[PDB]
Amino acid sequence: EFMSAIKPDMKIKLRMEGNVNGHHFVIDGDGTGKPFEGKQSMDLEVKEGGPLPFAFDILTTAFNRVFAKYPDNIQDYFKQSFPKGYSWERSLTFEDGGICNARNDITMEGDTFYNKVRFYGTNFPANGPVMQKKTLKWEPSTEKMYVRDGVLTGDIEMALLLEGNAHYRCDFRTTYKAKEKGVKLPGAHFVDHCIEILSHDKDYNKVKLYEHAVAHSG
Question: What domain range includes position 185?
């Protein structure tokens, strides 16, 4: 099906407001992406609350599954959600008891996706890798997409690589909901993801972020 609303080159604008372990912040994003290649990049700037007193990496997956290369034999719920858009809500449950809830309301105005992002985190141990800024990157992942009680859901076993050859596990569950009624739910499938901070200044007040995502049947 031809997607009139999804241009090969799209702009991306974003505002995140959040609070992690009591620390408030606002972060702006300006980016571009190629929905049919499953690739996007974004320049992020912390606008309030910097220097952030926790690992920037916990935030990065909150900075849109439109940017995923879908084969023709899998229903692309995300590209089919436009022009009206969709929203998602995600739990990030970390192995040491830290917990985040993130939400994004995604709209489209012309060639630009807009993102209203909220990020709440709590219960991170003060001595843990998040509050001590010991993370290096997220490992590449595979999201399992399926319908759970009528709602499109993505589950991911994620891991942050830490300093010293260690990993720090986090389980994602994301629910995805189109704004238009009657958008056809897809069959179960997978999305491979790789997210990377390409560059950052010393205290992560400015960050360049990149993601590549590809859907597959199994």
Answer: 10-216
